[PDB]
Amino acid sequence: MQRSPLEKASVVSKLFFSWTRPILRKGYRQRLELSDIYQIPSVDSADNLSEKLEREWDRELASKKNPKLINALRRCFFWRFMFYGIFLYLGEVTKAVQPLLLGRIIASYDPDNKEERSIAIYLGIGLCLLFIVRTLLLHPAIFGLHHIGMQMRIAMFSLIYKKTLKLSSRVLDKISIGQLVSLLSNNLNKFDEGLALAHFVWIAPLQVALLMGLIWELLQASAFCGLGFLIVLALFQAGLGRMMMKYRDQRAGKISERLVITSEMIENIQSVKAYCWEEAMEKMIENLRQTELKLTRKAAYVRYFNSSAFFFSGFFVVFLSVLPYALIKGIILRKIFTTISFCIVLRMAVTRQFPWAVQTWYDSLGAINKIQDFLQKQEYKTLEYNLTTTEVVMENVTAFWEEGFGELFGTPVLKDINFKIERGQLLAVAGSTGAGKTSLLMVIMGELEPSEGKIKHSGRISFCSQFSWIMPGTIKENIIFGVSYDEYRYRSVIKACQLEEDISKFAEKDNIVLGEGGITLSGGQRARISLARAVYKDADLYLLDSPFGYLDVLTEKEIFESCVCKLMANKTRILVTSKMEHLKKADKILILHEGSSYFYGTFSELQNLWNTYLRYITVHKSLIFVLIWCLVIFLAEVAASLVVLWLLGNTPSYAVIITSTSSYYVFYIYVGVADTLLAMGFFRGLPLVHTLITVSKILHHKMLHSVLQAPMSTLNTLKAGGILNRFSKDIAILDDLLPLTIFDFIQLLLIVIGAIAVVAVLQPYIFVATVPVIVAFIMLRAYFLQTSQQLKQLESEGRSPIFTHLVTSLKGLWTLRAFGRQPYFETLFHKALNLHTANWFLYLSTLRWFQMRIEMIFVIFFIAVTFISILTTGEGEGRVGIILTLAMNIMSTLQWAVNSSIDVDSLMRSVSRVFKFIDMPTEGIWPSGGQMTVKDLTAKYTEGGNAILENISFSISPGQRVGLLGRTGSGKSTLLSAFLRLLNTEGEIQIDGVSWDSITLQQWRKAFGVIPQKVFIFSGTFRKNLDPYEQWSDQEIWKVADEVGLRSVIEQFPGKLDFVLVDGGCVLSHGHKQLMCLARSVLSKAKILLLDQPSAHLDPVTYQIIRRTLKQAFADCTVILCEHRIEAMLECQQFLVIEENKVRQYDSIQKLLNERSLFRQAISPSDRVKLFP
Ligand SMILES: Cn1c(=O)c2c(-c3ccccc3)n3c(c2n(C)c1=O)[C@H](c1ccc(Br)o1)Oc1ccc(C(=O)O)cc1-3
Ligand SMILES: Nc1ncnc2c1ncn2[C@@H]1O[C@H](COP(=O)(O)OP(=O)(O)OP(=O)(O)O)[C@@H](O)[C@H]1O
Ligand SMILES: Nc1ncnc2c1ncn2[C@@H]1O[C@H](COP(=O)(O)OP(=O)(O)OP(=O)(O)O)[C@@H](O)[C@H]1O
Ligand SMILES: [Cl-]
Ligand SMILES: [Mg+2]
Ligand SMILES: [Mg+2]
């Protein structure tokens, strides 16, 4: 990372953007490398801008009764804004007065205009000086405005993240990741560039006043006709803007919903594949896209007319201005040409610059208002004592989850809870599924506010969640969690949590890079990493919500005896548990039942109780037909224009006066009106944008289909930020920005080519004069696009870390707030912001360099032309000047065309990224009895890696019960996934004589019914979550829910079976989701079932629910039951034990437990009575 050249530069180098030379030379030859990017200027760093805006916003909040964010932004940026606006206005003024000199210079070609031939050289000098000053005034101001806009955007994003970290729990249920992602994605690049157009709300009226004053000279009272036409057109454009904004308002919610569903699906792709649910998800997304595309199409239709307003107004203004003048007296061709010259500037001011500025103000003020409304939301109440007597006490606590029901005080989740615990004691909390154990910890943490009662303690806490949270980084980073590294503590914690055995089996040992969510590890490994993180922190109170759910009895016993009771014997602990052995040595015991305290006391009492354009064009067949139709109409118009033009030169008082020496004006007039003569009407414009929108629809469908069928090895590489970035920003670009940009480019190209051909055919000496300018423009464009494409790719990639950080911050907010690590995460977010800023700044600077170089080349050519024309003009007409000035007039449209081509190529990178995503590789009654045979099965996760399971062979009789067991991290889930071909495999598997190499993947996967270890619940109704294909009547669903035991749970919510679940099922407790998975497995009438720990955190009472069902729901079925619970192993006939990456088979569990002394000694005694009666 080398220092940016901007900081240490020169004044002339800054004015001409010369400091960008080293990068442009470097990327023209080769690929840009890591050491090619500069550090950002210190003024753009996120910390400084965040601090400044935060101070101004706090002053605004603390001073005024009606605060406004726009006031703080003004106090931060107004002076520089006005400073650049003044120079922008001075630059724009020079265009208004250019016809005064150019018109006289052109009139001097006529020998009858003896007066203007006297001072031609002075007019030429003045024109050259004007041309030089305009370039110097315009481009630096535009760069300054872009820089200011970038600074505002960065500051606001920092404020948004800081506010997000403080949101109250009651507010979180109303905002999803989709809404925040949409908010960031919408303003990420548009806000910066709007500032370059903002000043035209007052620059344009002054231009109109000056131009009307100047047109009064030539045509006094007849100019008002054209002005009235323009004032009607402006009203029309205002109305069109209102309709477009109305269409945008109705579309945003549907985009947020689609983003939520897509992110959830791609996160749970493994369950999606195991369920064979791909088509259902595709149908859901297609239904959402169909609703949003209609609004997109209507907005595009209204934007087409708004854009075409400029091109169709050219003929009307001139004709309406001239007709009264040419009727009540004569008119000369010179006056007509001068009127056209002035009217071009007038039309650009009225129909292009002012409405764009008005729309920019609308968009920016709306975004700022939305940000302020977000910034004024309800916050987590931190009001509590940070120092007490270390006697943790809870008195008369009654709590409600529903804010409306609680304020109306709707049933309470907690009712009159009392307890008191001393320093260094242990309290064990027990109860049935859904009793309110997690909710009690929520109250103690302060995330759930009680209506009645109160809780007192010191305030330094540590927290271990039922659902583990893993952040991006290594294992050591996940454990030390942003504080200093201590060797003795780290070793003690690593040893105590039984992690050394799993740590010693990794290539990086401990520096393995864990992704977001820890999908590389098993369930028990993630749980133990979370426990180690909780124990590493020093605090006065440790809350542990059921940390032994995914562990075998031996590991659980070791951890409980060596960590909770030995390593923290002198601290205050609250452990949620259901094992009766753990309750014996608890100092105090609390038992919950349906929100009430069934018992509080002691145990002793309880016993007593470039080929990218071509693909894009050929995606859809109708676009080709539309383009050919446009070309045919264009050819007909060109031919008609040529025929009409040749007639005036072949044919010979009237309203128009033409002399012999003044006829050269005719061609000059044609070039001034071709913009209107070759304008694309609604017979060509509307079908084009319609078909481009259709192309966007097709591309999104293909992208989603391609993603859903990739192999797991490919899918495991992608990050959540990358998925969100590609599906949000690139798709939005393809939907909105590409069609109209393409329309503008095509219109400009048609105008240029038509004018060139028509002029050249009659005068084949202008084409040859225009050749060198065209060549120079093309060479410069080719040179610049070699570096520009790479820089745009880097900037596009730079967005992903921001979204990834936001997603991971949202997932683990409660842990972050409990530990008190908000500043650390804020620093990481600022890092991501700066990383994006470097590339974005480098792209903007190079773009400014290119535009200035094009402008300078045009100026040099015009300066050379003007003096030659004046010099070679003698007593006769200046033929050389006549040809050269007309040639230079045509290049004026070519410059605009080249800039339009640059922005089109900039937008096409999104198409290239979508295509890269589309080309991902594809991973691609018979079940009569249920027999299986496995022969030499080997399994691995990546090709050429460690083999988790090597050379396994066994067989199963049809309709038999098999118990799969092993230590946490052995590879039971690996064997379960190998059955469904979810990883890389070798060997053969046969079901009733049919091998998996004889049929397709879908048919093989349809033979199984599965219960995965990770439960997937998406946004939708209860009914939709139970079956997405809608093939069962509500009677059958209700009967199944009766059998599983989900009656009261479903009837607890206002919409019985129609309630919509949000936040991945936030309202449901942990065991209810397992019950929802068992109901899914029951609804599928599958002959072979693979169940991965169906009872993970259930109490023995609730386990009786899953019992009896395996004996009624699945009677004649082959069941493979992976379980850590010893009781469940009493209903198996075959046993498979995984150890040393190998599988061993047993007939009786007494024989199994005879050969393992430690494991037998770990068995609970009541279980031992049930095993050895
Ligand atoms: C006689 N005569 C001009 O005086 C032209 C001018 C012009 C007028 C006054 C001062 C400076 C230039 N302009 C253009 C001119 N043509 C083609 C022309 O024949 C041409 C154009 C106009 C329409 C399209 Br499509 O392309 O490009 C221009 C692009 C932007 C602007 C801008 O005012 O921002 C003006 C353009
Ligand atoms: N955000 C919420 N809004 C409404 N009800 C909720 C919410 N979160 C939990 N509940 C409900 O509150 C009750 C208590 O659930 P909680 O998760 O605290 O139970 P638990 O004892 O931890 O359960 P488990 O043993 O399954 O882990 C349940 O009926 C649950 O559905
Ligand atoms: N997606 C993956 N990519 C690479 N290695 C993996 C992946 N998933 C698991 N592993 C590794 O493979 C081994 C087997 O893990 P597996 O999930 O099969 O264990 P398990 O016996 O099911 O454990 P638990 O009882 O904790 O669920 C572990 O050491 C784990 O780290
Ligand atoms: Cl003129
Ligand atoms: Mg719980
Ligand atoms: Mg597992």
Swiss-Prot record:
Outcome when changing residue 301 to C: In CF; uncertain significance
Effect of residue 583 to S: In CF; impaired maturation of glycan chains
Effect on the protein of changing residue 148 to T: In CF; uncertain significance; loss of bicarbonate transport; decreased inhibition of epithelial sodium channel (ENaC), when tested in a heterologous system; no effect on protein maturation, subcellular location at the plasma membrane, nor on chloride channel activity
Residue ranges occupied by any ABC transmembrane type-1 domain in the UniProt entry: 81-365, 623-906
InterPro entries registered for this protein in UniProt: AAA+_ATPase, ABC1_TM_dom, ABC1_TM_sf, ABC_transporter-like_ATP-bd, ABC_transporter-like_CS, ABC_transporter_C-like, CFTR/ABCC7, CFTR1_ATP-bd_dom1
In-chain residues carrying the UniProt-annotated modification Phosphoserine: 522, 1166
Cytoplasmic-side positions: 1-77, 147-195, 244-298, 691-741, 786-846, 903-1173
Phenotypic consequence of residue 522 to R: In CF; impaired maturation of glycan chains
Residue stretches spanning the membrane: 78-98, 123-146, 196-216, 223-243, 299-319, 340-358, 623-643, 670-690, 742-762, 765-785, 847-867, 882-902
Gene Ontology terms: cellular component: apical plasma membrane; cell surface; chloride channel complex; clathrin-coated endocytic vesicle membrane; cytoplasm; cytosol; early endosome; early endosome membrane
Effect of residue 903 to H: In CF and CBAVD; decreases channel activity; no visible effect on protein maturation
Domain ABC transporter residue range list: 410-609, 932-1165
Outcome of substituting residue 820 to R: In CBAVD; uncertain significance
Outcome (variant: residue 178 to R): In CF; loss of bicarbonate transport; no effect on protein maturation, subcellular location at the plasma membrane, nor on chloride channel activity
Tissues and organs where the protein is expressed, per its UniProt entry: Expressed in the respiratory airway, including bronchial epithelium, and in the female reproductive tract, including oviduct (at protein level). Detected in pancreatic intercalated ducts in the exocrine tissue, on epithelial cells in intralobular striated ducts in sublingual salivary glands, on apical membranes of crypt cells throughout the small and large intestine, and on the reabsorptive duct in eccrine sweat glands. Detected on the equatorial segment of the sperm head (at protein level). Detected in nasal and bronchial superficial epithelium.
Outcome reported for the amino acid change (mutating residue 977 to P): In CF; loss of bicarbonate transport; no effect on protein maturation, subcellular location at the plasma membrane, nor on chloride channel activity
Interaction with GORASP2 as annotated region, ranges: 1108-1173
Residues annotated for ATP 2 binding in this entry: 941, 966-973
Summary of the function given for this chain in its UniProt record: Epithelial ion channel that plays an important role in the regulation of epithelial ion and water transport and fluid homeostasis. Mediates the transport of chloride ions across the cell membrane. Possesses an intrinsic ATPase activity and utilizes ATP to gate its channel; the passive flow of anions through the channel is gated by cycles of ATP binding and hydrolysis by the ATP-binding domains. The ion channel is also permeable to HCO(3)(-); selectivity depends on the extracellular chloride concentration. In vitro, mediates ATP-dependent glutathione flux.
Entry's family note: Belongs to the ABC transporter superfamily. ABCC family. CFTR transporter (TC 3.A.1.202) subfamily.
The protein, known as: Cystic fibrosis transmembrane conductance regulator
Organism listed in the record: Homo sapiens (Human)
Gene (name only): CFTR
